[PDB]
Amino acid sequence: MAEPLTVSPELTANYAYFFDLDGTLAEIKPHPDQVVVPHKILQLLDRLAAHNAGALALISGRSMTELDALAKPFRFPLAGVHGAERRDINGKTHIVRLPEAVVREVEALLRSTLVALPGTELESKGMAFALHYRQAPEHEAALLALAQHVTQHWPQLALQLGKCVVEIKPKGTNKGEAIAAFMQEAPFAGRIPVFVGDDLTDEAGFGVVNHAGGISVKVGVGATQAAWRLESVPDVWRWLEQINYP
């Protein structure tokens, strides 16, 4: 249904760019700390943002600190934890805050329930919890069910499944509303949104980008509502390089 992306926009057009990180700008790794965005890709992203009035943001499930570590030394506008954290063009940060008791109780519950599922990792993000199972995919069901119970008992929380992960996020947080928040602010406002992603959390973004008359690009295999598809992360790199130097 999605058609292959074989054209690259002009460098100085009227576009606003949104990129996912893991699986879109950097190749998937067995461990999150092994992920690297090549320095030339970061330079190309900086040049694209510069020629489009700075209207380029990184929309990711990572925390903003890890996004800063990955994009160092560059400091882009950011949306982390699927939108629960954001940083606009002026550097102002917006953080969704959960009650302290909810965070404490949910963290304790997950830590205790994790013992009977070896190889799974619990990553606490302040206002979210990621359950990784790449080292032991057989627990994928269990974690899922477990998360489904948490969201049942704490209505403040919603589910976000993803590649080798089950995340529990604040309800109402999604990449679509993060892109929406960016698109009503300068310098993104007035430009055509472009969003490149690869996972389920990105579909929301795709939706809001399609309704706005923008360009949605899916990376990798799988069904999608994005209008365009790129085969792999190196193809995203080639696409970016073609934008910068046709």
Ligand X SMILES: OC[C@H]1O[C@H](O[C@H]2O[C@H](CO)[C@@H](O)[C@H](O)[C@H]2O)[C@H](O)[C@@H](O)[C@@H]1O
Sites of contact with Cl ion (CB under 5 A): 61, 201
Out of 199, 205, 228, 239, the only residue in the binding site for Mg ion (CB under 5 A) is 199
Edge-to-edge strands of the sheet including 192-197?
Answer: 3-4, 228-230, 215-219, 192-197, 15-19, 56-59, 78-80, 85-87, 93-95
> What is the bridge-based pairing of β-strands 165-170 and 129-132?
antiparallel
Say if residue 235 carries a ligand binding annotation. no
32 binds, among ligand X, Mg ion, Cl ion, none (CB under 5 to 8 A by kind): ligand X
132 binds, among ligand X, Cl ion, Mg ion, none (CB under 5 to 8 A by kind): ligand X
Residue nearest to ligand X (CB): 61
Sites of contact with ligand X (CB under 6 A): 22, 28-32, 35, 61-62, 123, 130, 132, 134, 162-165, 167
Say if residue 161 carries a ligand binding annotation. no
For residue 2, give the DSSP letter: P
Return d(Cα 127, Cα 103) in angstroms, integer: 7
Which string of x and - marks every residue 2-41 that binds Mg ion (by CB under 5 A)? ------------------x-xx------------------
CA count, 13 A, side-chain hemisphere, 233: 18
Query: Which residue, 55 or 84, is less far from ligand X as judged by CB?
Result: 84
Structure tokens at 122: 């619990």
- Cα 29 to chain centroid distance, Å, stands at 16
165 binds, among ligand X, Mg ion, Cl ion, none (CB under 5 to 8 A by kind): ligand X
- Say which residues have a Cβ less than 8 Å from residue 54's Cβ, sequence separation at least 6: 77, 89, 187
Q: Considering the candidates 20, 68, 199, 202, report the single residue annotated as catalytic.
A: 20
Edge-to-edge strands of the sheet including 129-132?
Answer: 121-124, 129-132, 165-170, 157-162
Closest approach of Cβ 67 to Cl ion, in Å? 11
Structure tokens at 66: 């890890």
Query: Which residue, 29 or 39, is less far from ligand X as judged by CB?
Result: 29
Query: Which residue, 198 or 203, is less far from Mg ion as judged by CB?
Result: 198
Active site includes 20?
yes
What positions carry a catalytic annotation? 20
For the annotated binding site, the residues are: 20-22, 198
